[PDB]
Amino acid sequence: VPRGSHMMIRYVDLDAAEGAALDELTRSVLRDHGASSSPSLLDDLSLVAHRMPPRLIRELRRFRTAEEASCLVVRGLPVDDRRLGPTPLDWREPPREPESEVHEVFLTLATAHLGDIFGWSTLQNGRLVHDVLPVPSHENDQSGHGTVELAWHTEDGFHPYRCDYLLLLGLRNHDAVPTGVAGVDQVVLSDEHREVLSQPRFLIRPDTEHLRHARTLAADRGSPHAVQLMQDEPEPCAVLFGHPDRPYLRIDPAFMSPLPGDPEAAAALEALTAELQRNLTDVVLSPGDLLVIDNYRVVHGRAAFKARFDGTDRWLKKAVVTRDLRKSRAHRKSAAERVLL
Amino acid sequence: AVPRGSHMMIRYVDLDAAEGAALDELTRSVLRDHGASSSPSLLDDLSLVAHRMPPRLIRELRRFRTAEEASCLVVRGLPVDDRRLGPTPLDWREPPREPESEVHEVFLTLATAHLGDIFGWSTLQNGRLVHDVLPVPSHENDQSGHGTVELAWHTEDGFHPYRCDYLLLLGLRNHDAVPTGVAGVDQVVLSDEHREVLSQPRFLIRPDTEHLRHARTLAADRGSPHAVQLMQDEPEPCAVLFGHPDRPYLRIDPAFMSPLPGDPEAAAALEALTAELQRNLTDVVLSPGDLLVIDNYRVVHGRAAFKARFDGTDRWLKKAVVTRDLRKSRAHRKSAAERVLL
Ligand SMILES: NC(=[NH2+])NCCC[C@H](N)C(=O)O
Ligand SMILES: NC(=[NH2+])NCCC[C@H](N)C(=O)O
Ligand SMILES: [Fe+2]
Ligand SMILES: [Fe+2]
């Protein structure tokens, strides 16, 4: 480290036949299995996912395995703006048209080539595919439902079982609102700072949205919620981890701080923060664009924009993947279930 | 959630003639095209090539890792020609007389694709991704796959935090029907008192002798102590039961572990669990073409005493190990893509 800027993002452009094959496959699969989250689809996910165009499978497998580019941008998925229908005003509200579920299938199949798709009880009702869109009364939130600038972060950076890969699929983005991404492989940083960041001298806390639902889940249940405990008594942890010659990253400026009375930890963090800010790079998700982010090597944010709440607003589908679901067994209700409690 | 019945432990799958012959054809052509069972051309495209296997076998493997019901899967029916196989090598270092066994190595490597990430150890069989399990002269008394005395049951590489999630053993030759012993944590009768003690870091699990032999060599060559050596000298205290306490995972290796010194509760709880696993130990005989997939987080395995002749007719298995996440061992690997631990 550091590696060059061109190495960070790899672009794949699907041709017409590949795009058409995916459109046909995903509609047919939705028809047969009933839903993008269907148990019948999940039980057979690998098999169905290997009916996708071979070149996409190879690109996805390579991206995961070789660990070269930290972001994979796949463009060319057919998306019809009319058939898609208006953007829902809330993730809770069902869409006018069933069309967006076809593209949820695409996302769900893509996860098979990366690892185990999973969800959170404390986000969108434990759904395996999220809707990223603006929601009234959340304009000022640091979440996917805000309109104020979304500070860049590791996805669920606080949680030890946060995702390995984050998938964002553009469905509608008329105003070309960019997603910011910066890679730990591109960071210039002193050996002094790296060693401090590699020690457990930092407290990273859950974000507003997780806590909102954690509070009500502890009410409906008897027991306290692990997420609530992570806010109140966060365990000290490292920001850089893995192999020190090319480490992985765990960071969330808006919901973290160094240990108190630890100036070298604070200085190291601001030094790392400044670099990630410097190398922040815009990726505009157009309809059909899939962005695969290595959540162990990348931070991402999203620019401020103006929501209209009139059916034309920015709309993404989102899925998270863990390379090993079994490591979160103690936070799940049974071995096979994919939602963390 | 525990204990479960013995009937739930082992699931048998019998391949039919068409499935067997399709696998024989597939693995032969894969070997031809890719040049070796461990070839980088094969490994880079492994899931695509693995998905050319018969769909019922793919579904049985995928369900086995996802459902986590049965803790052992026995797939029978892989064609294995005893004559074309040629004589069992006298050591894993000796190349076999015939190239036939590498065809079955390919079956094994392909099977791993549906369970997770195949990996290896620098300190075992020179970092090979598929091992040979067979008796070697001078090692009759070893607690390894090369011994002929009773192999005490254990979690595979129990000492290591990045030990495998799944262990695959493929029978090639076993004329005298030597049984592989298996016992599952799901089937054990244990008190809550013992379970609590076993869930705390009050046990020291150390590497087996085979690991350390090679670690000592690699230490002198690289010019620094090997991680495995440190694990032998200063083992970090760890729990024998982990995961969810209602249906826990198991990490144990009696022949290479001890309870914390001066800890009689740890000593007693370990002895209780040990005696219970011993009572529930179940014989599975691997005949030619029998694949045994073991969940290493829920099962211990051993092997009965037998007599080796070292005349080319002795018991011979192929072996591979799978981790559900290769990335977690990054700090003990040379680079991100490298599949062999340092
Ligand atoms: N600083 C952060 N962690 N920002 C992202 C929060 C995203 C939020 N958990 C959501 O589901 O929309
Ligand atoms: N008690 C044990 N850990 N026994 C198994 C040792 C297996 C040995 N590492 C081998 O490669 O053959
Ligand atoms: Fe995010
Ligand atoms: Fe073993």
Pairing of strands B117-121, B299-303: unpaired
**CB pair distance less than 8 Å for B66 and A327:** no
Cα atoms found within 13 Å of the Cα of residue A283, Cβ hemisphere only: 28
If one residue of A90, A128, A209, A273 were mutated to test the ligand 1 pocket, choosing by the most ligand atoms within 8 A of its CB, it would be A209
Q: Is the Cβ atom of B149 under 6 angstroms away from ligand 2?
A: no
Q: Hey, is B249 helix, strand or coil?
A: strand
Residue in the block written with tokens 């045994």: B292
Phi, psi (deg, nearest 5) at residue B282: -125, 130
Q: Estimate the crossing angle of helix B101-113 against helix B17-34, to 10 degrees.
A: 100
Classify the C-alpha dihedral A102-A107-A108-A110 as positive or negative.
positive
DSSP labels, A112-171: HTTSEEEEETTSGGG-SSEEE---TT-TTSSSTT-SS-EEEE-TTTT-TT--SEEEEEEE
Among protein residues, the one whose CA lies closest to atom 6 of ligand 1: A143
Tokens of A133: 């869109």
Task: Give the single-character DSSP code of B97.
Answer: S
What is the 3 state secondary structure string of B212-245?
A: HHHHHHHHHHHCCCCHHHHHHHCCCCECCEECCC
Residue from the list B114, B247, B333 with its beta carbon closest to the beta carbon of A46: B114
First to last CA, chain B: 38
Q: Hey, is A177 helix, strand or coil?
A: coil
Q: Is the Cβ atom of B255 under 6 angstroms away from ligand 2?
A: yes
Minimal Cα distance from B43: which residue of A? A65
Rounded to the nearest angstrom, the minimum Cα separation between B110 and chain A is: 14
CA dihedral B294, B133, B284, B58 (to 10 degrees): 40
Query: For residues A6 and B268, what is the distance between their CA atoms, to the nearest angstrom?
Result: 59
Query: For residues B228 and B214, what is the distance between their CA atoms, to the nearest angstrom?
Result: 10
Phi, psi (deg, nearest 5) at residue A148: -65, 155
Pairing of strands B166-173, B340-341: unpaired
**CA-based nearest residue to A111, from A162, A147, A164, A151:** A164
Cα atoms found within 13 Å of the Cα of residue B147, Cβ hemisphere only: 14
Known binding residue B7? Answer is no
Phi, psi (deg, nearest 5) at residue A286: -85, 165
B77 to B96, B225, B282: CA distances (angstroms): 23, 45, 21
Query: For residues B141 and B335, what is the distance between their CA atoms, to the nearest angstrom?
Result: 37
Phi, psi (deg, nearest 5) at residue A44: -115, 25
Q: Ligand 1 center to residue A46 CA distance, Å?
A: 29
Phi, psi (deg, nearest 5) at residue B205: -115, 125
Q: Hey, is B88 helix, strand or coil?
A: coil
**CB pair distance less than 8 Å for B247 and A47:** no
Tokens of A158: 């606080």
Residue from the list B66, B243, B244 with its beta carbon closest to the beta carbon of A336: B66
Q: Ligand 3 center to residue A154 CA distance, Å?
A: 7
Q: Estimate the crossing angle of helix B55-67 against helix B17-34, to 10 degrees.
A: 90
Residue in the block written with tokens 């051993």: B302
Helices first, then strands: H and E counts in chain A: 10, 16
* Contacts with B161 from chain A: Cβ below 8 Å: none
> Which amino acid is it at A207?
D
Q: Is the link from the previous residue into A2 a cis peptide, with omega within 30 of 0?
A: yes
Q: Is B54 touching A (CB cutoff 8 A)?
A: no
Query: For residues A135 and A147, what is the distance between their CA atoms, to the nearest angstrom?
Result: 9
Among protein residues, the one whose CA lies closest to atom 10 of ligand 2: B144
Q: What number of C-beta contacts closer than 8 Å exist between A and B?
A: 76
Residue from the list A66, A329, A335 with its beta carbon closest to the beta carbon of B337: A66
Minimal Cα distance from B244: which residue of A? A330
Query: For residues B21 and B25, what is the distance between their CA atoms, to the nearest angstrom?
Result: 6
Length of chain A counted residue by residue: 341
Residue from the list B48, B243, B337 with its beta carbon closest to the beta carbon of A65: B337
Q: Does residue A274 contact residue A266 with C-beta atoms inside 8 Å?
A: no
B-contacting residues in A 294-333 (Cβ below 8 Å): 296, 323-327, 329-330, 332
What was the elucidation method?
X-ray
> Which amino acid is it at A227?
V
Query: For residues B333 and B335, what is the distance between their CA atoms, to the nearest angstrom?
Result: 6
Q: Ligand 3 center to residue A142 CA distance, Å?
A: 9
Angle at B55 between CA B51 and CA B56, to 5 degrees: 140
Listed in order, strand segments (DSSP E) in B38-113 are: 72-76
**Beta bridge pairs of residue B321:** B119, B167
Query: For residues B108 and B129, what is the distance between their CA atoms, to the nearest angstrom?
Result: 10
Among protein residues, the one whose CA lies closest to atom 7 of ligand 2: B144
**Beta bridge pairs of residue A73:** A11, A291
**CA-based nearest residue to B289, from B11, B21, B59:** B21
Q: Does residue B311 contact residue B263 with C-beta atoms inside 8 Å?
A: no
Q: Output b/e per residue, A19-41; b: 16+ Cβ within 10 A.
A: bebbbebbeebbeebeebbbeeb
**CB pair distance less than 8 Å for B59 and A44:** yes
**CB pair distance less than 8 Å for B58 and A46:** yes
Phi, psi (deg, nearest 5) at residue B147: -90, 165
Query: For residues A205 and A250, what is the distance between their CA atoms, to the nearest angstrom?
Result: 12
* Contacts with B66 from chain A: Cβ below 8 Å: 43, 336
A-contacting residues in B 239-278 (Cβ below 8 Å): 243-245, 247, 249
Q: Does residue A183 contact residue A8 with C-beta atoms inside 8 Å?
A: yes
Residue in the block written with tokens 């005493």: B305
Q: Ligand 2 center to residue B270 CA distance, Å?
A: 20
Q: Does residue A155 contact residue A162 with C-beta atoms inside 8 Å?
A: yes
Q: Output b/e per residue, A305-315; b: 16+ Cβ within 10 A.
A: bebeeeeebbb
Task: Give the single-character DSSP code of B179.
Answer: E
Rounded to the nearest angstrom, the minimum Cα separation between B82 and chain A is: 33
Query: For residues B79 and B276, what is the distance between their CA atoms, to the nearest angstrom?
Result: 37
Q: Ligand 2 center to residue B146 CA distance, Å?
A: 9
First to last CA, chain A: 38
Rounded to the nearest angstrom, the minimum Cα separation between B263 and chain A is: 27
Q: Hey, is B293 helix, strand or coil?
A: strand
Query: For residues B59 and A203, what is the distance between their CA atoms, to the nearest angstrom?
Result: 43
CATH 3.40.50.1700 holds for A1-341: no
Q: Does residue B165 contact residue B323 with C-beta atoms inside 8 Å?
A: yes
- For this entry, resolution in Å reads 2.1
Query: For residues A77 and A99, what is the distance between their CA atoms, to the nearest angstrom?
Result: 13
Q: Hey, is B274 helix, strand or coil?
A: helix
Tokens of B192: 């809550």
How many CB atoms are located within 10 Å of the residue A198 CB?
16
Q: Is the Cβ atom of B124 under 6 angstroms away from ligand 2?
A: yes
DSSP labels, B253-271: -GGGEEEPTT-HHHHHHHH
Pairing of strands A339-340, A116-120: parallel
Query: Which H or E run contains B172?
Result: strand B166-173
Enumerate long-range contacts of A23-27, CB under 8 Å, 24 or more apart: A23/A77, A23/A78, A23/A102, A25/A51, A25/A52, A25/A109, A26/A102, A26/A103, A26/A105, A26/A106, A26/A109, A27/A102, A27/A105
Query: For residues B132 and B210, what is the distance between their CA atoms, to the nearest angstrom?
Result: 14
Q: Is A67 touching B (CB cutoff 8 A)?
A: yes
Tokens of B247: 């249906």
Q: Ligand 2 center to residue B208 CA distance, Å?
A: 6
Q: Which fold has domain B1-342?
A: Double-stranded beta-helix (3.60.130)
Q: Ligand 4 center to residue B273 CA distance, Å?
A: 19
**Beta bridge pairs of residue A291:** A73, A168
What is the 3 state secondary structure string of A48-94?
A: HHCCCCHHHHHHHHHHHHHCCCCEEEEECCCCCHHHHCCCCCCCCCC
Q: Does residue A173 contact residue A241 with C-beta atoms inside 8 Å?
A: no
Q: Is B163 touching A (CB cutoff 8 A)?
A: no
Task: Give the single-character DSSP code of A286.
Answer: -
Classify the C-alpha dihedral B58-B62-B64-B65 as positive or negative.
positive
Q: Output b/e per residue, B250-285; b: 16+ Cβ within 10 A.
A: bbbbbebbebeeebebbbebbebbbebbeebeeebe
Q: Does residue A318 contact residue A166 with C-beta atoms inside 8 Å?
A: yes
Residue in the block written with tokens 């000298």: B233
B309 to B136, B140, B179: CA distances (angstroms): 10, 11, 17
Query: For residues A117 and A108, what is the distance between their CA atoms, to the nearest angstrom?
Result: 7
Angle at B23 between CA B20 and CA B26, to 5 degrees: 150
Enumerate long-range contacts of A332-335, CB under 8 Å, 24 or more apart: A332/B244, A335/B67, A335/B68, A335/B247
**CB pair distance less than 8 Å for B247 and A335:** yes
Query: For residues B312 and B307, what is the distance between their CA atoms, to the nearest angstrom?
Result: 13
Give the nearest ligand 1 atom to A155 CA: 3
